[PDB]
Amino acid sequence: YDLIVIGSGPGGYVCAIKAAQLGMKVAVVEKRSTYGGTCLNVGCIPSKALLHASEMFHQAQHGLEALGVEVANPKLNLQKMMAHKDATVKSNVDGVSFLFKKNKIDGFQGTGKVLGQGKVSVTNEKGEEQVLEAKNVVIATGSDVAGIPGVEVAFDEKTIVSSTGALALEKVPASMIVVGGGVIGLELGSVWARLGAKVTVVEFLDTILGGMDGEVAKQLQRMLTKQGIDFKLGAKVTGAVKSGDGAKVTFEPVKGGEATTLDAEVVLIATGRKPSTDGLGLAKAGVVLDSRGRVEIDRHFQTSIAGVYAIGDVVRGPMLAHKAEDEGVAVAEIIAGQAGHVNYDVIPGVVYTQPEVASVGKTEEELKAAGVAYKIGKFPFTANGRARAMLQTDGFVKILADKETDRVLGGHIIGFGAGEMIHEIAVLMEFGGSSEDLGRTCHAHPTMSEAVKEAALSTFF
Amino acid sequence: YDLIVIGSGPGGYVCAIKAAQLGMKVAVVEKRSTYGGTCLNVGCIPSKALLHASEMFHQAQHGLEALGVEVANPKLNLQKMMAHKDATVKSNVDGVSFLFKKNKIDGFQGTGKVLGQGKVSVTNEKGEEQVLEAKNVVIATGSDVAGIPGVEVAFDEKTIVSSTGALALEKVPASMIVVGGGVIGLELGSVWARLGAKVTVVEFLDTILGGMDGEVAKQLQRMLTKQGIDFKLGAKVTGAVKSGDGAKVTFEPVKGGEATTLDAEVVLIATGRKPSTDGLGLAKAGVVLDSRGRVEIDRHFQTSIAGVYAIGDVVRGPMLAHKAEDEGVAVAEIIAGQAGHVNYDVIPGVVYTQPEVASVGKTEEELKAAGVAYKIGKFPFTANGRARAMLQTDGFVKILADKETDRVLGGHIIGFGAGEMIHEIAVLMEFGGSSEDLGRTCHAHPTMSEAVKEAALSTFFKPIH
Numbered sequence: 001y002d003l004i005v006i007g008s009g010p011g012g013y014v015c016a017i018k019a020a021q022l023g024m025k026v027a028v029v030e031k032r033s034t035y036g037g038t039c040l041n042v043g044c045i046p047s048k049a050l051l052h053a054s055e056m057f058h059q060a061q062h063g064l065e066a067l068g069v070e071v072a073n074p075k076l077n078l079q080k081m082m083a084h085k086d087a088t089v090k091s092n093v094d095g096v097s098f099l100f101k102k103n104k105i106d107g108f109q110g111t112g113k114v115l116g117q118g119k120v121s122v123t124n125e126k127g128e129e130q131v132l133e134a135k136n137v138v139i140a141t142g143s144d145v146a147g148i149p150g151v152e153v154a155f156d157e158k159t160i161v162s163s164t165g166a167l168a169l170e171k172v173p174a175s176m177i178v179v180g181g182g183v184i185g186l187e188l189g190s191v192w193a194r195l196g197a198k199v200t201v202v203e204f205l206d207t208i209l210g211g212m213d214g215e216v217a218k219q220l221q222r223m224l225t226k227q228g229i230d231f232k233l234g235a236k237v238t239g240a241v242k243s244g245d246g247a248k249v250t251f252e253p254v255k256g257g258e259a260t261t262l263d264a265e266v267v268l269i270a271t272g273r274k275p276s277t278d279g280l281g282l283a284k285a286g287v288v289l290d291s292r293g294r295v296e297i298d299r300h301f302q303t304s305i306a307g308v309y310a311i312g313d314v315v316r317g318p319m320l321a322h323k324a325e326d327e328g329v330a331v332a333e334i335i336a337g338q339a340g341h342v343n344y345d346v347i348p349g350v351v352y353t354q355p356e357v358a359s360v361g362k363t364e365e366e367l368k369a370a371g372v373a374y375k376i377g378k379f380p381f382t383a384n385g386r387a388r389a390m391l392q393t394d395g396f397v398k399i400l401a402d403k404e405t406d407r408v409l410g411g412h413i414i415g416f417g418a419g420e421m422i423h424e425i426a427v428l429m430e431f432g433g434s435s436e437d438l439g440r441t442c443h444a445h446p447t448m449s450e451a452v453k454e455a456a457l458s459t460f461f
Numbered sequence: 462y463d464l465i466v467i468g469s470g471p472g473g474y475v476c477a478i479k480a481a482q483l484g485m486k487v488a489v490v491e492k493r494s495t496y497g498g499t500c501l502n503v504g505c506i507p508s509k510a511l512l513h514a515s516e517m518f519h520q521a522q523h524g525l526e527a528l529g530v531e532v533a534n535p536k537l538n539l540q541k542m543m544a545h546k547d548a549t550v551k552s553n554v555d556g557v558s559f560l561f562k563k564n565k566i567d568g569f570q571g572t573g574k575v576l577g578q579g580k581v582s583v584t585n586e587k588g589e590e591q592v593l594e595a596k597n598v599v600i601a602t603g604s605d606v607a608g609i610p611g612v613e614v615a616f617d618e619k620t621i622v623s624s625t626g627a628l629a630l631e632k633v634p635a636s637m638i639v640v641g642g643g644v645i646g647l648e649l650g651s652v653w654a655r656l657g658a659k660v661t662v663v664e665f666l667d668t669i670l671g672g673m674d675g676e677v678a679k680q681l682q683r684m685l686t687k688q689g690i691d692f693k694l695g696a697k698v699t700g701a702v703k704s705g706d707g708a709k710v711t712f713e714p715v716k717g718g719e720a721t722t723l724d725a726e727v728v729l730i731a732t733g734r735k736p737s738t739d740g741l742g743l744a745k746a747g748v749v750l751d752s753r754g755r756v757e758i759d760r761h762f763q764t765s766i767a768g769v770y771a772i773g774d775v776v777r778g779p780m781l782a783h784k785a786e787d788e789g790v791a792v793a794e795i796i797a798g799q800a801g802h803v804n805y806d807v808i809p810g811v812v813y814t815q816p817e818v819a820s821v822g823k824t825e826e827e828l829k830a831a832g833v834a835y836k837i838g839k840f841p842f843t844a845n846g847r848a849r850a851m852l853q854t855d856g857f858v859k860i861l862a863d864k865e866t867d868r869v870l871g872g873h874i875i876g877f878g879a880g881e882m883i884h885e886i887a888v889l890m891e892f893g894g895s896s897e898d899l900g901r902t903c904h905a906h907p908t909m910s911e912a913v914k915e916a917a918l919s920t921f922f923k924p925i926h
């Protein structure tokens with residue numbers, strides 16, 4: 001082959017397609033019985049299907065009467081909801097399969113191992129091996145669930161669960177504890193809170209969400225608290241164990257203090273994910289890892305070994321499907337002899353709660369930390385005509401712009417359809433646009449996108 | 462006054478606020494008891510409130526069981542739906558009146574008339590005339606409902622209605638005939654169809670929507686047809702009259718000959734709106750109108766009378782609220798001595814049906830007529846992960862780009878949230894970007910906006926998905 005990709009998550013599968021379109025003969029080596037990796041199988045896709053259906057459940061209970069639409073107390077058919085989740089996964093998995101066949105990409109089921117000298121071994125569950133040969137190898141093995149630092153935790157996937165078990169619970173738990181107030185914890189904890197679980201989120205940091213913009217994260221926390229989610233922030237989990245029919249979670253203040261124990265029927269552990277390297281034979285092959293276990297790479301995605309490249313969640317940068325796909329495209333282009341580029345300054349991030357959160361570019365914390373003087377413009381959806389007509393008035397758009405040049409440096413949206421609207425700000429930033437330029441662009445009225453224009457005008461005036 | 466604005470429609474109101482923010486002393490002359498003109502009182506705002514409510518009604522009936530949410534048979538409370546429409550109208554109108562207070566803008570209730578030479582007369586309901594003077598007058602009088610080419614029709618606003626009556630029907634009609642297959646006809650027709658009317662759209666052109674890109678308009682017709690709306694296209698209406706307690710529309714094929722009569726409980730006349738200059742005294746002032754009744758203006762929005770300007774639905778260009786507002790800002794900036802500019806090449810248009818339709822830039826018919834060689838990329842929502850998760854898979858994005866330079870010339874979206882997603886294509890076109898520029902911008906996965914990225918990539922080369 002011209003290229004062997006090891007893994008078929010977003011980064012690898014897109015890399016394989018792009019390379020195939022650039023005329024290469026490609027093989028993709030994958031353990032899993034389906035393509036699509038974490039995102040399509042056990043990540044973005046299933047959780048988005050549950051988020052959508054649970055949101056429609058919530059809206060049926062609370063958002064229809066003020067519109068003149070009178071329904072009897074909505075009832076949940078959880079199995080039917082899970083069948084929607086499954087059908088959505090199957091569409092996405094089959095879509096990959098169809099794309100590999102369209103593009104004549106050869107798929108190999110089994111565990112791949114990097115040998116070094118343009119060789120890769122594949123071993124299928126039946127035990128037999130095959131050596132494949134290729135001029136280029138891309139490692140695209142993705143990430144795995146992490147545990148809790150210093151705490152031993154036994155995942156059983158019914159009581160102590162990872163996101164995988166939490167997507168497939170057999171019944172709405174009466175109560176659920178989410179360890180980790182990052183994107184995955186808050187999204188899954190909203191799903192179950194909507195369906196009737198009493199949900200508490202326990203988080204090490206004093207704030208939810210990673211280094212997302214502090215103001216937006218605090219506003220999200222406030223809204224999710226109104227939706228009935230309890231938060232225990234600055235809390236160091238020291239134990240999470242099955243206990244009887246449920247589980248027990250022990251935590252104490254991070255800064256020291258008396259311990260608390262909480263009981264719940266289910267505990268979701270959703271701490272940061274980690275690069276997945278085990279099994280690739282990297283030590284023997286001479287592929288160097290950094291101190292966090294990431295495959296070390298240069299700016300051309302090349303590892304310490306010639307002809308071997310790495311992308312996606314197994315290397316540095318945000319662990320996001322679309323980041324991984326953009327790297328897959330760049331490395332394919334690089335291998336075909338074009339320079340490939342990923343613009344690391346304009347990668348949007350979205351949290352699919354309601355309100356939805358979306359960001360691109362810098363946060364206030366990053367600008368302050370860099371000593372950059374900036375201007376802030378904010379416009380609330382309560383002042384927007386479409387938000388009012390749809391009764392979706394929570395949240396705001398904030399634009400950050402350089403003090404001296406008015407260049408937009410970041411935009412952050414909390415509110416309905418945030419993860420769609422952020423793209424007009426991503427496009428603006430690709431052109432080095434100013435807040436003036438954004439605010440002067442004609443936006444249709446009445447649309448929620450008018451709040452992005454208004455925020456930009458506020459930043460400029 | 463530095464500035465007198467005649468009309469408080471979106472053009473005139475925004476003009477007034479910008480002017481005030483630029484340091485000017487502004488009066489607004491308005492006949493209606495409330496501000497906001499057509500868009501906020503009888504136009505965009507109430508329409509969008511009924512469209513959202515009536516769509517939630519349809520989703521409650523049809524869109525919940527497949528997701529595991531059991532609600533039996535939802536009931537319409539028309540009174541409460543209308544109450545949401547009126548609440549939305551009230552916040553928008555009260556908002557305009559707040560911004561006038563905050564910017565120290567004076568309002569005068571009455572009919573404004575352009576006298577020339579710095580003066581405007583205001584006649585109130587009582588018959589008293591006050592004469593206001595200002596260095597600048599902006600005509601922002603908006604538009605009115607049009608009739609049917611050479612057919613007389615007597616609007617009564619319960620059986621033979623314009624958009625105004627259609628927004629406030631006291632009960633769901635069994636049947637409604639809408640004359641005009643433009644944006645307003647399709648939107649209002651959709652509202653009542655969802656709430657249980659049998660709806661039929663009768664339209665002179667062989668296509669619904671303008672004016673708008675042909676493939677998109679054709680796809681929308683197809684979807685609305687599946688939703689139970691009937692279309693009689695290529696149809697000339699020769700009569701529309703009460704046959705108490707309902708109404709009767711007669712038409713014949715524009716090209717052929719044989720006539721048809723159709724009865725319904727309510728008939729909506731929704732043909733193109735027209736500029737409203739009634740009461741301004743323009744002939745006596747010397748302000749030249751064109752053949753279509755529009756105020757003639759130059760590049761600075763200035764009429765044939767020095768110091769008299771016009772913006773909005775009364776002058777050339779798309780009759781859209783955000784267009785009127787853009788003109789309102791530009792002219793306030795011009796009058797202050799600054800470079801007011803409106804980019805007519807980038808003014809998005811949105812049709813709030815389901816599926817929603819949005820366009821910016823050129824349509825394929827425009828490019829073909831101009832002889833421009835172009836490339837097309839299209840990506841369907843059936844291939845988008847977020848659209849699948851939300852069961853909102855109808856429609857597509859289409860990007861049109863110059864054959865030689867790859868510069869994006871137009872973009873067109875039919876599907877859920879189209880009027881929001883059109884803005885990243887508007888931004889791209891504002892900077893003169895190419896489809897490659899747009900297709901290589903990182904878009905979050907899974908979002909419906911990824912279909913815009915993939916449609917751009919297909920324009921430039923090939924899509925990935």
Ligand SMILES: Cc1cc2nc3c(=O)[nH]c(=O)nc-3n(C[C@H](O)[C@H](O)[C@H](O)COP(=O)(O)OP(=O)(O)OC[C@H]3O[C@@H](n4cnc5c(N)ncnc54)[C@H](O)[C@@H]3O)c2cc1C
Pocket residue numbers: 006007008009010011012013029030031032036037038039040042043044045047110111112113140141142143163184276278279280311312313314319320321322323324352906907
């Ligand atoms: C609940 C959840 C929700 C998420 N939501 C989002 C979201 O909304 N948006 C977003 O951008 N990101 C989201 N993510 C993260 C997203 O799943 C990852 O960013 C994305 O899947 C990474 O793509 P990848 O190709 O880097 O690796 P992965 O998708 O993890 O897949 C690579 C593949 O390698 C396989 N593999 C590993 N070792 C071998 C070997 N030795 N031989 C053969 N095959 C191997 C694995 O089986 C896997 O299929 C979510 C993650 C989770 C857990």
Ligand SMILES: Cc1cc2nc3c(=O)[nH]c(=O)nc-3n(C[C@H](O)[C@H](O)[C@H](O)COP(=O)(O)OP(=O)(O)OC[C@H]3O[C@@H](n4cnc5c(N)ncnc54)[C@H](O)[C@@H]3O)c2cc1C
Pocket residue numbers: 445446467468469470471472473490491492493497498499500501503504505506508571572573574601602603604624645737738739740741772773774775780781782783784785
């Ligand atoms: C049902 C419907 C739905 C619509 N939906 C949309 C949409 O979704 N999006 C969109 O962009 N556009 C929409 N429009 C069109 C939009 O309403 C108009 O393009 C917009 O309102 C124009 O603003 P303006 O400055 O041009 O005038 P107008 O909004 O018409 O305001 C002009 C004002 O001048 C007043 N006036 C007139 N003559 C005099 C006088 N002699 N003295 C004093 N006052 C006077 C009038 O009473 C009026 O208030 C819709 C229209 C209708 C009917």
